[PDB]
Amino acid sequence: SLKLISNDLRDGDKLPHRHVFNGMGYDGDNISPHLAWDDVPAGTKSFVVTCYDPDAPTGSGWWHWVVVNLPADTRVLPQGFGSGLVAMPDGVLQTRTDFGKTGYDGAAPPKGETHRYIFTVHALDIERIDVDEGASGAMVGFNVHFHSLASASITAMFSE
């Protein structure tokens, strides 16, 4: 089955400071973590990668990063892919996060809280989801829900 791994994170471990937000009282490097996947289901035509915190106290969690329309041959996202280190491959789109912009912005939980930061890769059965960069994480999620063949995730914990 689809497997997601990372050179930076380890499922269940504390999110390294390199991926923590650089503002809101924090001083992390704010760099998106490397992600890599294997064993993709037959019929996969594209992938969606997201970072979500289900514990943010907002009534709907918090989308930290949303990448859509990665081509069928994608098997990796280098560190900093969502931080402006690299130009986007043709057709790939980073959509809108709860930070009101596109791209990766890291963890920045409230005082005394410990939250889960879930990185997920979804293999879809369609080549392109029809959204533009203003699409919200829920709008991308609705598309993923109807087109997902498989998903795999890594969860990092972060507190303070």
From Swiss-Prot:
Pfam families: PBP. It is found in: Cytoplasm. The keyword Cytoplasm applies. Its main location: cytoplasm. It comes from the Bacteria. Keywords: Cytoplasm. One of its GO terms (cellular component) is cytoplasm. The keyword Cytoplasm applies. Transmembrane segments: none annotated. NCBIfam families: PRK10257.1, YbhB/YbcL family Raf kinase inhibitor-like protein. Homodimer. Belongs to the UPF0098 family. This is UPF0098 protein YbhB. It comes from Escherichia coli (strain K12).
